[PDB]
Ligand binder design. Sequence first.
Ligand SMILES: *[C@@H]1O[C@H](CO)[C@@H](O[C@@H]2O[C@H](CO)[C@@H](O[C@@H]3O[C@H](CO)[C@@H](O)[C@H](O)[C@H]3NC(C)=O)[C@H](O)[C@H]2NC(C)=O)[C@H](O)[C@H]1NC(C)=O
Ligand SMILES: *[C@@H]1O[C@H](CO)[C@@H](O[C@@H]2O[C@H](CO)[C@@H](O)[C@H](O)[C@H]2NC(C)=O)[C@H](O)[C@H]1NC(C)=O
Ligand SMILES: *[C@@H]1O[C@H](CO)[C@@H](O)[C@H](O)[C@H]1NC(C)=O
Lengths: 183, 39, 135
Amino acid sequence: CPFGEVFNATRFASVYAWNRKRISNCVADYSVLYNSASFSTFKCYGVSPTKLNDLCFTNVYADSFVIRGDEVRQIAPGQTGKIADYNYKLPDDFTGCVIAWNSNNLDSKVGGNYNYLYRLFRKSNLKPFERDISTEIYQAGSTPCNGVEGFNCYFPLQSYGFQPTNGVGYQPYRVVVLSFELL
Amino acid sequence: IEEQAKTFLDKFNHEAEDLFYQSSLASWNYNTNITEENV
Amino acid sequence: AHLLGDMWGRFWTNLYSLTVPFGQKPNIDVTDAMVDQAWDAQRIFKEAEKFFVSVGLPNMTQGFWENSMLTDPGNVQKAVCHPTAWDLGKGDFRILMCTKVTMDDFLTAHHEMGHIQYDMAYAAQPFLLRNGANE
Ligand SMILES: *[C@@H]1O[C@H](CO)[C@@H](O[C@@H]2O[C@H](CO)[C@@H](O[C@@H]3O[C@H](CO)[C@@H](O)[C@H](O)[C@H]3NC(C)=O)[C@H](O)[C@H]2NC(C)=O)[C@H](O)[C@H]1NC(C)=O
Ligand SMILES: *[C@@H]1O[C@H](CO)[C@@H](O[C@@H]2O[C@H](CO)[C@@H](O)[C@H](O)[C@H]2NC(C)=O)[C@H](O)[C@H]1NC(C)=O
Ligand SMILES: *[C@@H]1O[C@H](CO)[C@@H](O)[C@H](O)[C@H]1NC(C)=O
């Protein structure tokens, strides 16, 4: 298990195009994770954390992205909101664990870091673990709008403008979702 | 229709909060350290 | 109209030295007990924060303590010195005042923190409804 990149990366991934690393045959030590005390949120759902270093699965997936501080409560099975509706949806019988830690000093820069976007309009909520990187314009009230903003119609992506002088709950948090699967 | 107004305000509530921030952050730097390159 | 204490007679508060009921009793003034216990600039707000946590209201936001400018600076720094409470947005609350060790600015510290605790409470509404319920 090479958690190197997967965790200590220099640049994370957006929230609307999360990453997806497929950890594979290895020796995984979830204790170095569980006790690192550097994580602000470590919830385990299918399985309590201390019994991870005593079980075996078929695949572990690790998804990575960056969100606001108070949006970490939508990364959980059965939630709603701009993030869980159409950015990243967790199935209703999730099995893995969700880890999250504050990263204000790395991702927020004076003048605003406008490189971290999220999707705020979609036709229909995502299926669990579904991903959507398109950019086709939206569609307000009945009308054409052949590629062009205007009355009732506009781009679908917004950007967190992160600043270092932002109250907590507005500072960037990095999130990693481990999902153990057993085919 | 009414659902068109809800989608109008969400676009507003995201663009306003950032533009009101900077416009009030620059008013802080003038108020606590006066130059004319801050006015 | 010209004997009321100010230019327009709006407040009669400058007539107190002529209209005091018992002038041989000192109206209570705790300013000497503040400079006898070596209270800094920070004690006046930390006792103010303990008043609000005493009633069941949240703490200050911990960005409140670095970003704010509780005195005029150590520089001879040109900066409008007027008590006020700022609500810049994004959950960033700052207080700007130039506080001196007096019971006057011990009280307006409680006044200006009250604008902050009102501001921290309705910060979950949408943007166009983040004012007081009337003026
Ligand atoms: C990238 O991820 C790494 C793995 O989590 C992080 O690594 C760890 O940093 C710890 C410092 O808090 C190290 O801890 C200590 O290790 C020494 C021996 O080297 C012991 O004597 C101490 O008792 C022990 N202290 C604690 C807190 O228990 C870990 O050794 C180290 N993990 C490794 C490399 O095995 C990195 O911090 C992280 N990137 C960075 C640079 O932050
Ligand atoms: C008032 O603030 C301004 C900007 O915040 C200061 O002006 C310059 O700030 C830059 C930082 O981006 C420094 O690199 C420069 O050295 C500053 N200019 C000078 C002449 O020092 C300004 O210094 C502040 N006022 C005072 C009195 O320090
Ligand atoms: C407020 O802060 C103090 C220390 O500054 C802490 O002891 C107290 O528990 C905090 N209040 C709450 C509700 O956590």
